Write a protein that binds this ligand. Structure first.
Ligand SMILES: Cc1cn([C@H]2C[C@H](OP(=O)(O)O)[C@@H](COP(=O)(O)O)O2)c(=O)[nH]c1=O
Ligand SMILES: [Ca+2]
Length: 129
């Protein structure tokens, strides 16, 4: 897998963000995670967490996995990094997302994320509290 550049256009919610990628605006949906919707418990906290992470970053990157790069809604499917830190993993590690939507061929970072979820759950963090 390869990191590629992108620039923040707008935070949207915990697991979706609007980025400029190859010069085009796209909504990205973060691979392998599920945040609560804004309307649901921890939803605002997930949204706040991702927002700060992407807004505070000097450098945003996206990393596609080996399989589909866009979903049925035309959202980009990627791992995203804020100054070298994976947003996907960080959400899970904080108990603000569950590992989810694990599809064959787009799951390179599955076990990394499951390990973070296990640590979050052990800490009884947020969603696991
Ligand atoms: C994360 C992810 C979601 N999706 C689709 C599956 C779900 O379809 P449905 O909308 O039919 O439920 C939806 C979940 O996204 P959200 O959690 O953003 O709603 O997005 C993918 O197809 N691939 C993916 O890797
Ligand atoms: Ca969601």
């Amino acid at each position: 897998l390869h990191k590629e550049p992108a620039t923040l256009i707008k935070a949207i919610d915990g697991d979706t963000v609007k980025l400029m990628y190859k010069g085009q605006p796209m909504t990205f949906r973060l691979l392998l995670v599920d945040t609560p919707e804004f309307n649901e418990k921890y939803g605002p906290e997930a949204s706040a967490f991702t927002k700060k992470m992407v807004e505070n970053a000097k450098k945003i990157e996206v990393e596609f996995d080996k399989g589909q790069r866009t979903d049925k809604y035309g959202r980009g499917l990627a791992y995203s990094y804020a100054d070298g830190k994976m947003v996907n993993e960080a959400l899970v590690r904080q108990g603000l997302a569950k590992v989810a939507y694990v599809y064959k061929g787009n799951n390179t970072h599955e076990q990394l994320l499951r390990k973070a979820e296990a640590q979050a759950k052990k800490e009884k963090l947020n969603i696991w509290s």
